[PDB]
C-alpha cells in the first residue's frame, strides 16, 4: 500500500523493472523517497479494488488502448501540462495522453510501424500501396514475399485497412465522436480489399505467423517485413544489410502507420499524488532522466526531441520517427477496446469467406457504438 515517504509503481515486468527502479533510485537519493517496483500480473483485477479500498498503487504504465480505459476507471489524476517540455517534445504526442480535454499522462515514447527490408534482395522498397503487389509479384518469383501479416491480430490489418480514408473514431473541437466512425467507411472496404487480394494472389500467406515470417525475413527468405522500432521480432542487432524506412503511401491520403505513446496515470487517491507528480515529469522524460533510463533499453524511441535527435541517427529509428510526425495517434478511447474485437473478427470473415465486407464492417461499428 501507500506510505508517507513511499511510492508504488506497477510496469510490465517483461521489460519494466531496470529503467525504472534506477530511475526511481535517483529520485530515492534526492528526496530520500522510498521507491518500490512491481511486475503487473495482477493489476487488471486490482484496478477496481484499489480505488476501492482508497490506497493501492501509485502509477500505473501504460498498455496500448488500455490505459485510456484507466483513465475512464479514475485511474489517474488531472495532471497539469507543462509548456516548456511540450517544445522539448513533440505537438501529436500529446493528445495520446490527454482525454476529454485534460492531461491523464506525459508522452515519454514514441512506437510506430515501419518498414524493414533487406538491402542484398531490394535496395529501393516500394514508395506507394500499389506498387507493393506489383512488386510482390516479382519477388514471389524468388519465394520472397513484399509484406508481412499473420491476421492473429487486427493490429497487422490496421495499416491496409485505415490506409484508404479509415480511422478509429472522429477527433472535433479537441473532442472525439463516439457516434462517428471510420470503421464502416467507403475508405475501410478499400483497405480489406487490398489484404485479400495479397492472399489470394499468394502475396501473402494467411496461416503464417509473424514469427515465422521474421524468422524467414532473418534468413532472407522474405524480403521485406513491418514492424515497429523496437526490432525486436526474432534477432538481436542485426548486421546484415537490414535497414528501415518508412511506409508507403497512396494518392496523396493518411496511408501512414498508427502512432502509440508511453503513458503514466497517478493514483487519485493517493496521499503522495504531489511525490508522484513532480518526480514523473523531470525524471522519466527529460534530459537527464531519458538519459538514464534508455540505458536498459536498445534504441529507445523517445518522446523528447533533444535525446531522439542523437539516436535517431539510427536507420531503425529514423524512418519511426518520421512516420510518428506523419502517421495517425492511437486513440486512447475506452471504446478502442471494441474497436479492436470489432475489427478482429470484421477481418477474419472477410478473409475466410463467411461475411462480405460491408456486412461485417457494419458489424463492427455497431459493436463500437453498442
Given at each position: 500500500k501507500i506510505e508517507e515517504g513511499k511510492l508504488v509503481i506497477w510496469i510490465n515486468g517483461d521489460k519494466g523493472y531496470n529503467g525504472l527502479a534506477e530511475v526511481g533510485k535517483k529520485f530515492e537519493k534526492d528526496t530520500g523517497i522510498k521507491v518500490t517496483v512491481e511486475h503487473p500480473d495482477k493489476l487488471e483485477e486490482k484496478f477496481p479494488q484499489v480505488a476501492a479500498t482508497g490506497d493501492g498503487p501509485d502509477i500505473i504504465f501504460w498498455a496500448h488502448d488500455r490505459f485510456g480505459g484507466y483513465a475512464q476507471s479514475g485511474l489517474l489524476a488531472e495532471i497539469t501540462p507543462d509548456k516548456a517540455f511540450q517544445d522539448k517534445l513533440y505537438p501529436f504526442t500529446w493528445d495520446a495522453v490527454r482525454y476529454n480535454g485534460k492531461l491523464i499522462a506525459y508522452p515519454i515514447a514514441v512506437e510506430a510501424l515501419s518498414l524493414i527490408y533487406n538491402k542484398d534482395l531490394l535496395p529501393n522498397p516500394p514508395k506507394t500501396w500499389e506498387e507493393i503487389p506489383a512488386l510482390d509479384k516479382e519477388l514471389k518469383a524468388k519465394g520472397k514475399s513484399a509484406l508481412m501479416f499473420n491476421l492473429q491480430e487486427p493490429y497487422f490489418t490496421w495499416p491496409l485497412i485505415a490506409?484508404?480514408?479509415?480511422?478509429a473514431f472522429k477527433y472535433e473541437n479537441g473532442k472525439y465522436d463516439?457516434?462517428?466512425?471510420?470503421?464502416?467507411?467507403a475508405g475501410a472496404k478499400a483497405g480489406l480489399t487490398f489484404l485479400v487480394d495479397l492472399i489470394k494472389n499468394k502475396?501473402?500467406?494467411?496461416?503464417?505467423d509473424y514469427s515465422i515470417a521474421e524468422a524467414a525475413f532473418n534468413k532472407g527468405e522474405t524480403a521485406m517485413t513491418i514492424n515497429g522500432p523496437?526490432?525486436?521480432?526474432?534477432?538481436?542487432?542485426?548486421?546484415?544489410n537490414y535497414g528501415v524506412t518508412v511506409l508507403p503511401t497512396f494518392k496523396g491520403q493518411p496511408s501512414k502507420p498508427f502512432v502509440g505513446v508511453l503513458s503514466a496515470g497517478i493514483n487519485a487517491?493517493?496521499?503522495n499524488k504531489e511525490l508522484a507528480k513532480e518526480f514523473l515529469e523531470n525524471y522519466l522524460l527529460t534530459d537527464e532522466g531519458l538519459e538514464a533510463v534508455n540505458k536498459?533499453?536498445?534504441?529507445?524511441?523517445?518522446?523528447?526531441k533533444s535525446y531522439e535527435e542523437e539516436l535517431a541517427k539510427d536507420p531503425r529509428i529514423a524512418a519511426t520517427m518520421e512516420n510518428a510526425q506523419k502517421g495517425e495517434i492511437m486513440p486512447n478511447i475506452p471504446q478502442m477496446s471494441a474497436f479492436w474485437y470489432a475489427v478482429r473478427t470484421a477481418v477474419i470473415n472477410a478473409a475466410s469467406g463467411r461475411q462480405t465486407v460491408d456486412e461485417a464492417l457494419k458489424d463492427a461499428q455497431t459493436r463500437i457504438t453498442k
Open positions: 490506409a484508404d480514408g479509415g480511422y463516439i457516434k462517428d466512425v471510420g470503421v464502416d467507411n502475396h501473402m500467406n494467411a496461416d503464417t523496437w526490432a525486436w521480432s526474432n534477432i538481436d542487432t542485426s548486421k546484415v487517491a493517493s496521499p536498459d533499453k536498445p534504441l529507445g524511441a523517445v518522446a523528447l
